[PDB]
Design a protein around this ligand. Structure first.
Ligand SMILES: NC(=O)C1=CN([C@@H]2O[C@H](COP(=O)(O)OP(=O)(O)OC[C@H]3O[C@@H](n4cnc5c(N)ncnc54)[C@H](OP(=O)(O)O)[C@@H]3O)[C@@H](O)[C@H]2O)C=CC1
Length: 342
């Protein structure tokens, strides 16, 4: 019995691989190159329960054919986490929409073709971006929940890369639900979506702390490099720690009740002010070297937007989430260890 993890070297995915290995699953991941694959197995101490396959590009609809061709019989759980979340891009349709959508369509078709009778559970790493309305997050009267969907269309979301990325998550997820609709009789697997907000926390391995991080964590790395007189980025959203997100993925395949659900993994709201308040208080080396802003005016003290109601998800997942202080501390301290500031 095996668990397949697409994009296994990713920020979230490495923490998933971690939790799977500790719960004694055999794990198979994919990475874009033999190099990244070998680096990942090595980092995990060449665990004999862990192996990797090379899947260079998920925009290819037959990208996952080979893994399910040869391992389909042994694969019981599929966690599809790979999706472009990168912004040095030339074209939204081609660098965001097509790969994310074809990634989902491809892997599910690979399952149908080679593992229709063995794969019991599929979990898709979607996003809160597939749930919310960007133009409306700022409105205190409105409410978003698991039944909410991103209103943007193919074409409309192509206005800018951030919108396109959000659309890509929406359409990759819609495609997964549509595929299960259209093939319900022809496949055995049940589907769950996991929909994280902004994901913070430490990288699985210290080696992977570099000058610039994965985009969600870069937001903290970036803040820690602003000078006191620099302008504070405007951002309002939910937050969640990466170890909590990884655990949400395990619970999403292990539980009966998470069959056919969308699970928003979100603890509470934040703005950058809330992140500054924490950095300033917990890291003396940062105080006086970063902005202060207006302390206490962030979302950890004020209702500043629409209500994210993920109470259903919190109840389905059945464990409590790290607060902002804990997740920001772990991110920042790990980075300061790489900068040599402690
Ligand atoms: N971080 C966050 O705040 C949130 C993340 N997510 C989702 O979580 C998932 C992982 O993101 P995260 O870990 O945060 O960021 P990462 O950039 O670290 O993870 C992205 C992963 O996807 C792989 N990937 C991207 N494009 C392709 C491609 N075209 N072909 C093959 N592999 C590809 C990457 O490979 P490589 O590293 O080699 O480039 C990497 O393994 C994504 O699906 C993302 O949408 C959802 C909500 C919030």
């Amino acid at each position: 019995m095996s668990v397949f993890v697409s994009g296994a070297n990713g920020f979230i995915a490495q923490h998933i691989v971690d939790l799977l290995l500790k719960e004694d699953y055999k794990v198979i991941g994919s990475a874009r190159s033999q190099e990244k694959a070998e680096n990942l197995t090595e980092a995990f101490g060449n665990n004999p329960k862990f192996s990797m396959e090379v899947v260079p590009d998920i925009s290819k609809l037959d990208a996952f054919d080979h893994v399910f061709q040869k391992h389909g019989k042994d694969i019981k759980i599929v966690l599809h986490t790979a999706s472009p979340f990168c912004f040095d891009i030339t074209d939204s349709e081609r660098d965001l929409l097509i790969p994310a959508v074809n990634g989902v369509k491809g892997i599910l078709h690979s399952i149908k073709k080679y593992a229709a009778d063995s794969v019991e559970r599929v979990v898709l790493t979607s996003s809160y971006a597939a749930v919310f309305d960007m133009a409306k997050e700022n409105d205190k009267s409105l409410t978003f929940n698991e039944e909410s969907w991103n209103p943007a269309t193919w074409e409309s979301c192509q206005s800018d890369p951030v919108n396109a990325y959000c659309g890509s998550k929406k359409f990759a997820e819609k495609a997964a639900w549509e595929f299960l609709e259209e093939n319900r009789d022809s496949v055995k697997f049940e589907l769950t979506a996991v929909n994280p907000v902004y994901v913070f926390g430490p990288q699985m391995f210290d080696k992977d702390v570099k000058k610039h991080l994965n985009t969600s964590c870069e937001l903290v790395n970036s803040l820690m490099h602003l000078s006191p007189e620099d302008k504070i980025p405007e951002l309002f959203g939910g937050y969640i720690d990466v170890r909590d997100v990884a655990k949400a993925h395990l619970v999403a395949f292990q539980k009966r009740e998470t069959i056919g659900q969308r699970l928003i993994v979100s603890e509470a709201r934040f703005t950058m002010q809330d992140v500054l308040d924490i950095l300033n208080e917990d890291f003396p080396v940062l105080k006086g070297n970063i902005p202060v802003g207006k302390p206490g005016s962030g979302a950890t003290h004020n209702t500043l937007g629409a209500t994210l109601d993920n109470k259903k998800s919190k109840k389905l997942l059945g464990f409590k989430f790290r607060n902002l202080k804990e997740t920001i501390d772990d991110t920042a301290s790990q980075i300061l260890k790489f900068e040599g500031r402690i």
